[PDB]
Structures are given as structure tokens and as C-alpha cells.
Assembly symmetry: C2
């Protein structure tokens, strides 16, 4: 639980998507809390609250609030609570995605309408709606951040409809940046490499072929989130920053990496 | 009505989205028909058959079929009709998009859920569904084409959720190209510059968009239906056999402009 710097001192923000200590949302929470941020964590509903409690305790988080990002009334209530507790907000982190697991295993061309719309609602639209509700609380400027992946830009096998959803999200970041920039609110994404069967293969491929010859870590993603959410990042908006050990630059499997 | 070449001789295909003679879909139809294609034109419902009849007659099109891309049964019936008439298909052109006109006037951040979902369904998902229906009719290869716009890539006015929908569409093109390429089916998009379709739309932002593109594009003119037709001829004919997953800009160069023409 050790705080190690003061880069986020005096900044208050909500992180949406921390359900365990292995996730990207957790890596970001740990990084900003270690730099003095005052954080609220969300949990899906009362039934799943006891899972967030100890994560909040280790971070030093004192405010946890219910939020189901597919439910407009739940999101509205969450911001009402933050408004009452804090009056203003400095940052929002949106680390939530959803898509049908079985359709990911199939071909993209076989995607069903229901899965397409559900995935788009949770993975893409929720960010826009959340941004709309955060705006009146972010009077003194601030920073809103979401997460993406290289499958938004190039075809990654079995990422299917999530690639399409993340492409939509990356575009939404740009349109949001224009709307919210009038209030000095930045809007950005981190395009993260995979962090350590299908998943094992993608992770190994990234290890073998990335320029740094390692996988992305939670600490890497936390560092980038600190840039974007602190005063260091005041001049960057509408951007998708790759935090993937350089994988995005590679146009072909390394000649001396093994095929797998 | 006069055929001028043979680039599409022996190719059969369906064009979805021709409702008048001013649209991109019409420009494409005119171009492929003039090169010898056998074309089927869709119309939205029985109400609109009167509007498409004279367009089809002037193109020499003998097959028209209902197709409302929000209704899976309608789409399924359309491909049933093509399979019965032709047995196989060489090309598909998808020129359909929809969003709530009132939300376009406002801010992207105020987009409603209903508008987002409906725009996504019609403007992006329908292309994927149509591609899935075409696949078994194109075992011998061919070409599937959709339309996009620079608002998919960069923020432009009076576009809002359509920018997000088009970005999703351009990503879907890439995924579809991987799925359908083993069968030698190419999947591509044309990112077209704005064209005047109405004498006056009554929307100042549209006048602005058109004017800005005209004066600041490298060619110092607006995109025409002929321009888009020619690009479609590349992508849909044998000339385009080696290109797939691509979004080709047919916008008089506007996409390269970082500031303004001097
Ligand atoms: O840019 P635009 O509005 O000028 O072009 C959009 C096109 O898509 C059509 N379209 C809208 N909804 C449709 C639907 N549900 N099914 C088939 N076509 C549809 C129009 O009829 C039109 O030709």
C-alpha cells in the first residue's frame, strides 16, 4: 500500500473496471494511488461488492460505488454520489469491455446482431455516456482515459467483433476530445499489449516479436496512465498511446522468431 | 444508358442503396452498367418501387428486389431471389447508412443510446450480415464494396456518431477480408469526398463542408459521381484482384491536407 510520489496529489478520480489484482484497471489504480491520488472504485452490484472491498483496502481507497456501465440510471447515480462526496472530479478511467466468448472463437463474418450491439454498447457507447455525465463535474479541466488494443488497427486472430468495437472507441476518443476540450478536459486511450490457450499464444507471439522482447506489464500501463492523467499530460488529447513494448511497429514476424 | 466498354462483361452483382440519380450508389451503377455488368438494384419497400423503376430502366437493369437492411428476413429473401435468378454473384455494393438527423446538429458527446445502436446496426453491422449472405454465392471469388468518408479517420463537422460508425465499418472491412479472402473474395471501401446531391440541403454545415473540400483539396474541385464510379470499376473488375481490406480515398486529395490550400 506504499505511496511513492506526489504526481497525483490533490487529484480525485473514479476507476471503473477493477475486479481483481491482475487487470489493467488494477495496474492503473495502483499507479495513481501510489502517487497520491484520491480514488473511488466501482463494483458491478451489491452481490459483487465483497470482491472489491479488499482491493480497495490495499489501495487505501475509502469510496466504493456501484456502477453497471450498461445501465444509464446506475451511471447517473454513480456520478451523483461522486458529486455529493467530492463536488468536482479530476479524472475518469474506463476499463470495461464485453463480447460473446464463443463468437470470438469463430469467424468475424459469423457475428450475430445481438452480440455486435451488446459488445458495442458496453465496449464503446458506455465511454461516451460516462464522459457526458463526468463533464459537469470537471469544471477545472481534467483527464478521461480508456483502453484499447492493436486489434482495432490490424486483424488479430479471434479478436473479431472486439476489434471493430475498439476501432469505434478510438474514433470516439477523437470526437470526444473536440467536444470536451472546450473545458480543458483531455480524452485519450492506451493501446496496451497483452499482459501475463488462445491467450497464451497471443502473449507468446508478442514476447517473441516485440522490439523490447518482453510482454507488457501492469507497471508499464500504470506509467502511461500517470502521464495521461497527471499534469504531465496536459498537452495531449485525442491520442491513442501504444504501451505494447513496440509491437505496433512490426510488419512481419521477426525472421529469427519461431513460428508457433 | 449507352454502354461504353467491356470491363464488367459477364459479371453479375447487386447494388444496395440507389434511390435517385444524384447518389454515389447511382454513380457506381452507371459506371458498372456502362461496362457491361448485369446488375440487380434493391429498393427499400413496396412504397419505393415506383422511384427505382425509371432509374433501373435507364440503366438497362431488368431485376429489382426489395431489401430493408434492418430486417434480416428481407435481406435473406433478397439473396434467395438472386440465387434463384443467377446461381452465383460476382459483386456486391453496399451504399447504405443511417443516423438521426437531429443529433448530427449537436455535440457527439450528447449522442443517445438508441441513435448509437440504430446507426451502428444500419451503417456498420448490415455490411457484415450481407457479406455473410453473399459468401456462399461467391465460391468462385469476386468483390464486395462499401462506402466510407474521412470522418472515420479525423473529426469533421455535422458527422458525430457517423464518424464512429464509419470507423467501425473500415475495421470490419479488414476482418471480413481475412474471412473471405481464401475464396478469393475481396472486401474494400471507397472513402469518398462530399458530393452535392441537393440544390440546397438548407444546412449551413453541409454548404461549408462542400465548399471547404472544393477550395482546399489538391485538385481544387469536389468529388464527382464519375470519380467514385471509376474507383468502383477498379475494385469490382479484374483490375482490382490484388487489393483487399483497403479503404481507397476518392476525394480529390483532401485527405492529405493538414491545414489549408495556399
Ligand atoms: O448518406 P445518405 O443518407 O445520402 O445515403 C443513405 C442510403 O441508405 C438508405 N438506407 C437507409 N436505411 C436503410 C435500410 N434500413 N435499408 C436499405 N437502405 C437504407 C437510403 O435509402 C439511402 O439510399
Amino acid at each position: 500500500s506504499m505511496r511513492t510520489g506526489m504526481l497525483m496529489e490533490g487529484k480525485k478520480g473514479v476507476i471503473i473496471g477493477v475486479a481483481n489484482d491482475k487487470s489493467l484497471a488494477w495496474g492503473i489504480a495502483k499507479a495513481v494511488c501510489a502517487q497520491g491520488a484520491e480514488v473511488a472504485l466501482t463494483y458491478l452490484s451489491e452481490t459483487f461488492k465483497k470482491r472489491v472491498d479488499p482491493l480497495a483496502e490495499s489501495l487505501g481507497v475509502k469510496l466504493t460505488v456501484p456502477c453497471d456501465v450498461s445501465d444509464a440510471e446506475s451511471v447517473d447515480n454513480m456520478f451523483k454520489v461522486l458529486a455529493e462526496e467530492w463536488g468536482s472530479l479530476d479524472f475518469v478511467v474506463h476499463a470495461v469491455a464485453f463480447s460473446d466468448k464463443n463468437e470470438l472463437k469463430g469467424r468475424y463474418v459469423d457475428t450475430s446482431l445481438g452480440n455486435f450491439l451488446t459488445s458495442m454498447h458496453i465496449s464503446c457507447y458506455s465511454f461516451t455516456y460516462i464522459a457526458s455525465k463526468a463533464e459537469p463535474l470537471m469544471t477545472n479541466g481534467g483527464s478521461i482515459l480508456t483502453l484499447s488494443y492493436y486489434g482495432a488497427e490490424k486483424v488479430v486472430p479471434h479478436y473479431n467483433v472486439m476489434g471493430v468495437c475498439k476501432a469505434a472507441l478510438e474514433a470516439s476518443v477523437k470526437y470526444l476530445a473536440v467536444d470536451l476540450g472546450k473545458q480543458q478536459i483531455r480524452v485519450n486511450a492506451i493501446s496496451a499489449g497483452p499482459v501475463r490457450s488462445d491467450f497464451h499464444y497471443i502473449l507468446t507471439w508478442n514476447k517473441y516479436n516485440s522490439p523490447l522482447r518482453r510482454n507488457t506489464t501492469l507497471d508499464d500501463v500504470g506509467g502511461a496512465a500517470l502521464y495521461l492523467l497527471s499534469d504531465l499530460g496536459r498537452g495531449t488529447t485525442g491520442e491513442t498511446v501504444h504501451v505494447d513494448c513496440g509491437y505496433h511497429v512490426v510488419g512481419m514476424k521477426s525472421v529469427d522468431a519461431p513460428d508457433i
